[PDB]
C-alpha cells in the first residue's frame, strides 16, 4: 500500500473507484483537492499537529529578523492571503 | 667474520626508555649461551644527538663513523632526519630507526616503523568516513596527509583539513572545534602527536565536545601512552592503532624480565608503560642479530675513514650489510618483520582498538593483504 | 542572500514560459512571495536545491542532505515547506 | 642541492678548507640549520640576503 | 495562532525549554494531554 | 600576527597554504571565507 510518490498515490485513489485512502499532509490534501479532475476529498480531522517554518544557519544573524518578519507577515494576515491566493484564488475546482 | 662486531647508537632527547631497552636488548643477546645463537659479540657505541643543532649531530654521526660501526641505530625528527638519512646513504652505512618512516624512496636506511596509511584509509572506507576534519601536524612527515588528499579527491570524500602543528594557544584549539561543531562535524582524525593529542582532547573534554555522538580516531601509534580517562567517560567513540600485543608469548616474556631489572641501571623501565618504540627498538636488535648471522653462515666478507671526503668513496661491503638486513623474516614484539627494497615494513599487522566506558577492547586487525578483517 | 527553496507545487514553480524568464523572475508559488515578503522586511537569489530532498541526517555517514544540509554547510535562508521538527532544530 | 644535506656539508668544508674570509649565500629551509650551525660553531661569517 | 513556553530574553533555558516542547510534541504525549483534559475529563462524552 | 590579534582583539582567519597542491582546495578557501563575508585578505606566500 505504500506509495513512491505522492502523484502515485493520487492516482491510486482516484483509480480505486472508493477502495483506496491516501494519508498525506493537509496541506497537500487541500492543494490536490482544487485541481482536475476535482475528484478527491479531505475527510476526517489532522492525526497530528506540524508546522512548516523558515529555517536559517545556527547563529545566523538573519533569525531574529527573519522570525519576527515572520510574525509581522501573520499578524497582518498575508500569510492568509498568500495561501488564499495560491490553494482557492488559483484552484480549478471552485468554492 | 669477526669474532666481534660493534655497532652505533644515536639517541635523541626523550629516549631514556628506548635506550634502556637497546641495552636490554644487547645484553639479553650476549648472556645467550647458545653458540649458533650467538656466534659472535655485539658491542655498542652510544651518543646522544642534540636535534636542533646539525653542527653537533654531525660531530656524533662522524665520531661513530670514524670509531669503526657495521651499522647505526637511532632516531631521528624532522629537523634532524635529512642529515643522518643522507650521511647514510652516501657513506653506505646502514640506519636501522624506530623513527617515522621517510616520505622519500631511499636506500641504506631501514624505518620499522609500520606504515599507518594503509589502516587509516581501511578504517575510514570500513566506518563509513565520508566526511570528517583532519587535524593534522608536520612533525612525523607528509605521508599521511597526502594519502589522506588522494582518497579525498578519488572517493570525493568532505575532509577539511586543518594544520595544528604552529597552534600555541589552548583558545585556537577551541575556536576551530566551536567552528567545526557549527557545521555539524561527529568525525574527527588527529594525526598528530602524543601531547597535541592530549591538548585537543582536553580542550574537547573543557567545551564538553564528548558525549557518545562524537568520534574520533587517534592517528599515532602509542595509544597508550594517550591520557583517555576522561573522554572514555564521556562515551564517545576512540578508535586506535597498535603493533604491540600484549598477549604475545613474547612480549609476555619480555616484560617479565623486564619490570624485574634495576632502576639505577636500567632508567624508566619498571615503574613506566612500555613504549612501542622500546619493542621497536628490542626488534631492530633482532633484525641486526639475524642479519649478521646470516653474513656469517653465507661466508660474506665483512670488515673507517672519514664523513666528508671528495670523491667520498664508499666502502664495498655496504651493499652486502644492507641486502642482508632487508631480506630478515624475523617474530618479534610487533610481530613479522619484513622489509622490502626500501626498508619499509611489509606483512606487518596493525591490531585497531575500539576504546568503550569498560575499557579498550582490541576491534580487529589490519593486513596488507586480508585488508583489517574485523572480529 | 542566497535562499535555498525546493520545487514543489504550490511553493515553487516554473513559469510557463521560463526559458525567455531568467533570475527569479523564472519561479512562482507561495514560498516566492513568502520570500519577496521576507525580503522586503529585513537582496537575495532563489537557489532551488541539487539534490531535491529536504533535509535529513545519513545514520552511517552523519552528512545532512537537502536544504536543511545546505544551511549547515554554509551555502545558503531556507523558505520551503520544511517540518519544524526535533532532530532539524538542533 | 638543498634537499641533500650531505652535498651542502660537502660544499661548505671545501669552501672552508679553501681558505676563506666570510662566505655569501642563500639558504632554504632545509639546509638553513646546517649552514648557520656550521657558520656558528667554526665562528664564520655568513652574510646571506 | 499558537500557545508557547515564553522565557526571559537571553536565558539559559530557552533552548532546552524549546527542545523538549519539540520532543514532547512528536513522542504524541501534548496531544495526549489535551485529550486527557478536554475529553477524558470531559462531561459530555462522544 | 597571532600576538597582535590576542592583543589588538582582531578577528584573523588563519590558514595555512603551504602544504597543498591542489588548487581546488585554494578555490574552496576562498568560497568559505567569502561565505562569511571576508573582504581583506593578507597573503604571506611564495612568489609562486
Same mark, same amino acid.
Given at each position: 500500500?505504500?506509495?513512491?510518490?505522492?502523484?502515485?498515490?493520487?492516482?491510486?485513489?482516484?483509480?480505486?473507484?472508493?477502495?483506496?485512502?491516501?494519508?498525506?499532509?493537509?496541506?497537500?490534501?487541500?492543494?490536490?483537492?482544487?485541481?482536475?479532475?476535482?475528484?478527491?476529498?479531505?475527510?476526517?480531522?489532522?492525526?497530528?499537529?506540524?508546522?512548516?517554518?523558515?529555517?536559517?544557519?545556527?547563529?545566523?544573524?538573519?533569525?531574529?529578523?527573519?522570525?519576527?518578519?515572520?510574525?509581522?507577515?501573520?499578524?497582518?494576515?498575508?500569510?492568509?492571503?498568500?495561501?488564499?491566493?495560491?490553494?482557492?484564488?488559483?484552484?480549478?475546482?471552485?468554492? | 667474520?669477526?669474532?666481534?662486531?660493534?655497532?652505533?647508537?644515536?639517541?635523541?632527547?626523550?629516549?631514556?626508555?628506548?635506550?634502556?631497552?637497546?641495552?636490554?636488548?644487547?645484553?639479553?643477546?650476549?648472556?645467550?649461551?647458545?653458540?649458533?645463537?650467538?656466534?659472535?659479540?655485539?658491542?655498542?657505541?652510544?651518543?646522544?644527538?642534540?636535534?636542533?643543532?646539525?653542527?653537533? @649531530?654531525?660531530?656524533?654521526?662522524? #665520531?661513530?663513523?670514524?670509531?669503526?660501526?657495521? $651499522?647505526?641505530? +637511532? =632516531?631521528? /625528527?624532522?629537523?634532524?632526519?635529512?642529515?643522518?638519512?643522507?650521511?647514510?646513504?652516501?657513506?653506505?652505512?646502514?640506519?636501522?630507526?624506530?623513527?617515522?618512516?621517510?616520505?622519500?624512496?631511499?636506500?641504506?636506511?631501514?624505518?620499522?616503523?609500520?606504515?599507518?596509511?594503509?589502516?587509516?584509509?581501511?578504517?575510514?572506507?570500513?566506518?563509513?568516513?565520508?566526511?570528517?576534519?583532519?587535524?593534522?601536524?608536520?612533525?612525523?612527515?607528509?605521508?599521511?596527509?597526502?594519502?589522506?588528499?588522494?582518497?579525498?579527491?578519488?572517493?570525493?570524500?568532505?575532509?577539511?583539513?586543518?594544520?595544528?602543528?604552529?597552534?600555541?594557544?589552548?583558545?585556537?584549539?577551541?575556536?576551530?572545534?566551536?567552528?567545526?561543531?557549527?557545521?555539524?562535524?561527529?568525525?574527527?582524525?588527529?594525526?598528530?602527536?602524543?601531547?597535541?593529542?592530549?591538548?585537543?582532547?582536553?580542550?574537547? @573534554?573543557?567545551?564538553?565536545?564528548? #558525549?557518545?555522538?562524537?568520534?574520533?580516531?587517534? $592517528?599515532?601509534? +602509542? =595509544?597508550? /601512552?594517550?591520557?583517555?580517562?576522561?573522554?572514555?567517560?564521556?562515551?564517545?567513540?576512540?578508535?586506535?592503532?597498535?603493533?604491540?600485543?600484549?598477549?604475545?608469548?613474547?612480549?609476555?616474556?619480555?616484560?617479565?624480565?623486564?619490570?624485574?631489572?634495576?632502576?639505577?641501571?636500567?632508567?624508566?623501565?619498571?615503574?613506566?608503560?612500555?613504549?612501542?618504540?622500546?619493542?621497536?627498538?628490542?626488534?631492530?636488535?633482532?633484525?641486526?642479530?639475524?642479519?649478521?648471522?646470516?653474513?656469517?653462515?653465507?661466508?660474506?666478507?665483512?670488515?673507517?675513514?672519514?664523513?666528508?671526503?671528495?670523491?667520498?668513496?664508499?666502502?664495498?661491503?655496504?651493499?652486502?650489510?644492507?641486502?642482508?638486513?632487508?631480506?630478515?623474516?624475523?617474530?618479534?614484539?610487533?610481530?613479522?618483520?619484513?622489509?622490502?627494497?626500501?626498508?619499509?615494513?611489509?606483512?606487518?599487522?596493525?591490531?585497531?582498538?575500539?576504546?568503550?566506558?569498560?575499557?579498550?577492547?582490541?576491534?580487529?586487525?589490519?593486513?596488507?593483504?586480508?585488508?583489517?578483517?574485523?572480529? | 542572500?542566497?535562499?535555498?527553496?525546493?520545487?514543489?507545487?504550490?511553493?515553487?514553480?516554473?513559469?510557463?514560459?521560463?526559458?525567455?524568464?531568467?533570475?527569479?523572475?523564472?519561479?512562482?508559488?507561495?514560498?516566492?512571495?513568502?520570500?519577496?515578503?521576507?525580503?522586503?522586511?529585513?537582496?537575495?537569489?532563489?537557489?532551488?536545491?541539487?539534490?531535491?530532498?529536504?533535509?535529513?541526517?545519513?545514520?552511517?555517514?552523519?552528512?545532512?542532505?537537502?536544504?536543511?544540509?545546505?544551511?549547515?554547510?554554509?551555502?545558503?535562508?531556507?523558505?520551503?515547506?520544511?517540518?519544524?521538527?526535533?532532530?532539524?532544530?538542533?
Amino acid at each position: 500500500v505504500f506509495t513512491k510518490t505522492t502523484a502515485d498515490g493520487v492516482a491510486r485513489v482516484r483509480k480505486s473507484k472508493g477502495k483506496f485512502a491516501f494519508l498525506l499532509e493537509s496541506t497537500m490534501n487541500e492543494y490536490i483537492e482544487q485541481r482536475k479532475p476535482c475528484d478527491t476529498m479531505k475527510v476526517g480531522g489532522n492525526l497530528d499537529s506540524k508546522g512548516y517554518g523558515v529555517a536559517t544557519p545556527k547563529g545566523s544573524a538573519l533569525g531574529t529578523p527573519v522570525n519576527l518578519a515572520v510574525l509581522k507577515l501573520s499578524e497582518q494576515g498575508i500569510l492568509d492571503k498568500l495561501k488564499n491566493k495560491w490553494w482557492y484564488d488559483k484552484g480549478e475546482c471552485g468554492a | 667474520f669477526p669474532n666481534t662486531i660493534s655497532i652505533g647508537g644515536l639517541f635523541m632527547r626523550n629516549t631514556v626508555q628506548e635506550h634502556s631497552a637497546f641495552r636490554f636488548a644487547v645484553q639479553l643477546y650476549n648472556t645467550n649461551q647458545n653458540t649458533t645463537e650467538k656466534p659472535f659479540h655485539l658491542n655498542y657505541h652510544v651518543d646522544h644527538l642534540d636535534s636542533s643543532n646539525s653542527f653537533s @649531530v654531525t660531530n656524533a654521526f662522524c #665520531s661513530q663513523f670514524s670509531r669503526g660501526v657495521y $651499522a647505526i641505530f +637511532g =632516531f631521528y /625528527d624532522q629537523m634532524s632526519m635529512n642529515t643522518l638519512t643522507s650521511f647514510c646513504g652516501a657513506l653506505h652505512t646502514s640506519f636501522v630507526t624506530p623513527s617515522f618512516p621517510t616520505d622519500a624512496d631511499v636506500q641504506f636506511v631501514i624505518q620499522m616503523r609500520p606504515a599507518l596509511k594503509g589502516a587509516i584509509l581501511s578504517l575510514l572506507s570500513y566506518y563509513k568516513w565520508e566526511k570528517f576534519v583532519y587535524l593534522y601536524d608536520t612533525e612525523r612527515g607528509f605521508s599521511v596527509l597526502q594519502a589522506i588528499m588522494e582518497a579525498a579527491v578519488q572517493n570525493n570524500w568532505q575532509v577539511t583539513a586543518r594544520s595544528v602543528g604552529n597552534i600555541k594557544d589552548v583558545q585556537e584549539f577551541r575556536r576551530i572545534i566551536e567552528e567545526m561543531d557549527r557545521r555539524q562535524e561527529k568525525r574527527y582524525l588527529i594525526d598528530c602527536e602524543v601531547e597535541r593529542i592530549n591538548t585537543i582532547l582536553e580542550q574537547v @573534554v573543557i567545551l564538553g565536545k564528548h #558525549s557518545r555522538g562524537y568520534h574520533y580516531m587517534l $592517528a599515532n601509534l +602509542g =595509544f597508550t /601512552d594517550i591520557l583517555l580517562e576522561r573522554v572514555m567517560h564521556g562515551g564517545a567513540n576512540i578508535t586506535g592503532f597498535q603493533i604491540v600485543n600484549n598477549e604475545n608469548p613474547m612480549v609476555q616474556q619480555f616484560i617479565q624480565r623486564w619490570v624485574r631489572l634495576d632502576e639505577r641501571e636500567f632508567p624508566e623501565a619498571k615503574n613506566a608503560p612500555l613504549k612501542y618504540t622500546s619493542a621497536l627498538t628490542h626488534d631492530a636488535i633482532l633484525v641486526i642479530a639475524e642479519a649478521f648471522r646470516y653474513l656469517r653462515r653465507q661466508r660474506v666478507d665483512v670488515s673507517a675513514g672519514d664523513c666528508l671526503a671528495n670523491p667520498a668513496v664508499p666502502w664495498s661491503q655496504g651493499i652486502d650489510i644492507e641486502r642482508a638486513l632487508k631480506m630478515v623474516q624475523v617474530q618479534g614484539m610487533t610481530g613479522n618483520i619484513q622489509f622490502d627494497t626500501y626498508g619499509r615494513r611489509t606483512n606487518y599487522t596493525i591490531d585497531v582498538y575500539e576504546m568503550k566506558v569498560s575499557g579498550s577492547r582490541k576491534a580487529g586487525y589490519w593486513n596488507e593483504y586480508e585488508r583489517f578483517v574485523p572480529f | 542572500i542566497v535562499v535555498t527553496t525546493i520545487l514543489e507545487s504550490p511553493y515553487v514553480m516554473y513559469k510557463k514560459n521560463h526559458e525567455q524568464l531568467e533570475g527569479n523572475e523564472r519561479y512562482e508559488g507561495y514560498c516566492v512571495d513568502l520570500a519577496y515578503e521576507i525580503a522586503k522586511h529585513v537582496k537575495y537569489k532563489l537557489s532551488i536545491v541539487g539534490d531535491g530532498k529536504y533535509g535529513a541526517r545519513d545514520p552511517e555517514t552523519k552528512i545532512w542532505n537537502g536544504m536543511v544540509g545546505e544551511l549547515v554547510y554554509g551555502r545558503a535562508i531556507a523558505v520551503a515547506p520544511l517540518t519544524i521538527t526535533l532532530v532539524r532544530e538542533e
